[PDB]
């Protein structure tokens, strides 16, 4: 929801074309009294309380909270025997059928999330096997998120990725309160 | 709109067995979009309801209403339709089983009134439905007699129990 923008919008009685003239005199006709033909009570009139988009739903959880949800997802995957550590994502062949028969023999699951350290150092073997599959997706370690971990049943991490995650997630557990954004120069950051 | 009345002459019954009794023939026919009121036409369809084909044609031949000449035309073409298409031997061996009127698709015109006032008049239309059945007209039910009234009253006196007890 933090990146949701609703584009729905309706027109009020002030935005519907026409509707400036009083339909008929206030008294005498024996009919109900109306001021415009575009009021909500009318057919073709404005919407009293409708969407007034574009509307944003932006909000931010505290950094320490968002970093803690990753720890829980990584912990739940291991406790439920859904986490698998690798040394390298290099396949013998770029055949997508091999990666599928390999996840069924080891009984991984119907969906697998492959996490590599960087996007440029990804072996071409695994890049050619996951580009043609739908449930075997490959992301870099920087793109790890609770939603994709929960959608996929099995999680696969490489050894470099493990060290990468521990460094980033444990830095929140021991850090000062920010004087200025962490994107600016600091004494010991990054590394 | 619905046109189910014309589809009732297309049902095909299975052949009857040797011991079963002769099945009477049923002939459905109608006329659509008649420039006439269904309320005025109802009095004509109620008249011939239950009559014989030849008796109904005689009552409609000397009636002054406009609907009479229309129904009589529908009965004459249902009579021929029965013997020609539905295997009816005698054209006089028919009676009016069902006869009613229905509302049709009507138009709307303006009727002018005084003081710049106006009314909305409708050009009325109607349908006429008739069902012919082979055989003589079923005998009318005799009026209830005193013996049946007394026989029914004593039957109510014998069906009464002791209420609100064991």
């Amino acid at each position: 929801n933090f990146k949701r923008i609703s584009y729905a919008k309706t027109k009020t009685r002030a935005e519907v074309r026409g509707g400036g003239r009083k339909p008929w005199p206030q008294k005498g006709t024996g009919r109900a009294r109306h001021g415009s033909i575009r009021s909500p009570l009318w057919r073709g009139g404005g919407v009293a309380h409708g969407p007034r988009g574009p509307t944003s739903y932006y909000y931010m959880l505290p950094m320490k909270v968002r970093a803690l949800g990753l720890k829980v997802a990584l912990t739940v995957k291991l406790a439920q025997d859904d986490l698998h550590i690798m040394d390298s994502l290099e396949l013998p062949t770029g055949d997508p059928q091999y990666l599928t028969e390999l996840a069924h023999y080891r009984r991984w699951g119907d969906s697998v999330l492959l996490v590599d350290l960087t996007h440029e150092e990804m072996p071409q073997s695994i890049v050619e096997a996951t580009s043609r599959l739908k449930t075997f997706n490959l992301i870099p370690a920087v793109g790890l998120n609770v939603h994709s971990m929960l959608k996929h049943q099995t999680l696969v991490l490489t050894l470099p990725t493990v060290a990468f995650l521990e460094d980033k997630l444990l830095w929140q557990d021991s850090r000062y309160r920010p004087l200025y954004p962490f994107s600016l120069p600091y004494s010991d950051f990054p590394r | 709109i619905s046109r189910k009345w014309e589809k009732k002459n297309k049902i095909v019954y299975p052949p009857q067995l040797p011991g079963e009794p002769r099945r009477p023939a049923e002939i459905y026919h109608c006329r659509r979009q008649i420039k006439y009121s269904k309320d005025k036409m109802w009095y004509l369809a109620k008249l011939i309801r239950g009559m014989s084909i030849d008796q109904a044609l005689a009552q409609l031949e000397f009636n002054d209403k406009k609907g009479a000449k229309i129904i009589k035309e529908v009965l004459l073409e249902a009579q021929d339709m029965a013997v020609r298409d539905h295997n009816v031997e005698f054209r006089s061996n028919l009676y009016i089983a069902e006869s009613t009127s229905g509302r049709g698709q009507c138009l709307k015109r303006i009727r002018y009134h005084g003081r710049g006032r106006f009314g909305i008049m409708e050009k009325v239309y109607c349908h006429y439905f008739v069902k012919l059945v082979e055989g003589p007209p079923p005998p009318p039910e005799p009026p209830k007699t005193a013996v049946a009234h007394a026989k029914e009253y004593i039957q109510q006196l014998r069906s009464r129990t002791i209420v609100h007890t064991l």
Partner: peptide, 15 residues
């Protein structure tokens, strides 16, 4: 007691 008169209102012809 001002003279109060309501003018007739015609409806759309197409109806």
């Amino acid at each position: 007691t001002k003279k109060r008169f309501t003018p007739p209102i015609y409806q759309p012809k197409f109806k």
